[PDB]
Amino acid sequence: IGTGFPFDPHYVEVLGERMHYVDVGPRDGTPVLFLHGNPTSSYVWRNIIPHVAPTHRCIAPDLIGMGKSDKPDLGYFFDDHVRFMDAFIEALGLEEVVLVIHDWGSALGFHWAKRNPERVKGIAFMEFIRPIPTWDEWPEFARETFQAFRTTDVGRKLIIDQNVFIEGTLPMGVVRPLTEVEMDHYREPFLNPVDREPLWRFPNELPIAGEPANIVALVEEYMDWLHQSPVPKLLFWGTPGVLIPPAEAARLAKSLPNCKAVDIGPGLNLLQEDNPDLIGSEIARWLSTLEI
Ligand SMILES: *CCCCCCOCCOCCNC(=O)c1ccc(C(=O)O)c(-c2c3ccc(=[N+](C)C)cc-3oc3cc(N(C)C)ccc23)c1
Ligand SMILES: [Cl-]
Numbered sequence: 001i002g003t004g005f006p007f008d009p010h011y012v013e014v015l016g017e018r019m020h021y022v023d024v025g026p027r028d029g030t031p032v033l034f035l036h037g038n039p040t041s042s043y044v045w046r047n048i049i050p051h052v053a054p055t056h057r058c059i060a061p062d063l064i065g066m067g068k069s070d071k072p073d074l075g076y077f078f079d080d081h082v083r084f085m086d087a088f089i090e091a092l093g094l095e096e097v098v099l100v101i102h103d104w105g106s107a108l109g110f111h112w113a114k115r116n117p118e119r120v121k122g123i124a125f126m127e128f129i130r131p132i133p134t135w136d137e138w139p140e141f142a143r144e145t146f147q148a149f150r151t152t153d154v155g156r157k158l159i160i161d162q163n164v165f166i167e168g169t170l171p172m173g174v175v176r177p178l179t180e181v182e183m184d185h186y187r188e189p190f191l192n193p194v195d196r197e198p199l200w201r202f203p204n205e206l207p208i209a210g211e212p213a214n215i216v217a218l219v220e221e222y223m224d225w226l227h228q229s230p231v232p233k234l235l236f237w238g239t240p241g242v243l244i245p246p247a248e249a250a251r252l253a254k255s256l257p258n259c260k261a262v263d264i265g266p267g268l269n270l271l272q273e274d275n276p277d278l279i280g281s282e283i284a285r286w287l288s289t290l291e292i
Pocket of ligand 1: 141164242243
């Protein structure tokens with residue numbers, strides 16, 4: 001499994017800030033837009049892109065506050081990410097896209113697609129944001145720790161002051177051990193404790209047991225859109241999962257129109273880090289089939 005990130009940095013000014021993005025592959029045709037989540041960056045896609053890039057343009061931004069993108073003194077609410085991602089997509093002139101999305105990047109991508117349904121030609125997704133109706137549907141092993149994260153004093157202490165989302169949660173979201181290079185590359189954006197705001201606001205945004213009500217609503221709205229859309233869909237899932245347990249993956253593979261579902265083997269949240277070969281191969285192949 002490659003630890004390298006052999007992509008030249010590109011930057012675009014967005015709302016007066018700058019965002020970093022990978023942009024590889026051919027200049028024409030429909031681009032594939034890869035959206036990471038918490039607490040990753042475009043780095044999470046490094047072993048998936050090289051399988052897609054021979055045939056398609058691959059664009060992988062770092063969310064505002066993350067990666068190599070700028071770090072303005074925001075609250076990094078989901079609304080903030082929405083604003084910056086809408087503006088990134090316009091600043092690059094993108095017209096139609098294929099979306100490849102994960103964790104909070106999935107809330108972004110689905111919320112975009114709902115609002116711009118004529119510009120979305122396919123969606124591949126994995127470990128994605130859906131409403132978690134009660135805390136019982138959060139996995140038991142991570143339950144206590146996510147509940148602590150969703151406080152101000154204790155959660156900030158953990159995420160911001162002790163860097164637990166990077167040091168603890170991130171390796172607990174991958175079945176294989178991450179290597180020290182890997183860990184250092186995920187550490188890099190968050191060396192300064194003050195830059196850890198998004199790492200804490202994210203889990204506080206998770207739509208769990210009805211809260212926060214605004215996020216619950218928005219997520220329900222794009223899940224309804226999704227259930228009704230004929231757009232081609234590709235769902236990766238793993239066992240036991242985190243956000244998407246196998247039973248849920250099986251239900252969505254039948255409930256969503258035009259949905260192909262692919263089991264990656266063992267997986268928790270960062271499926272890309274457990275089976276990037278399968279994921280990149282199956283995306284490249286599926287992309288071919290969107291023309292058939
Ligand atoms: C969009 C959703 C994203 C989900 C992201 C990944 O998924 C969630 C899986 O949740 C795990 C939640 N639990 C913890 O973060 C946690 C609990 C207990 C302990 C612990 O060590 O007591 C840690 C922990 C570590 C666990 C594993 C680990 N590995 C596999 C190398 C390393 C750990 O290191 C630390 C370090 C600290 N510090 C104070 C620095 C604290 C806890 C751990 C995590
Ligand atoms: Cl999160």
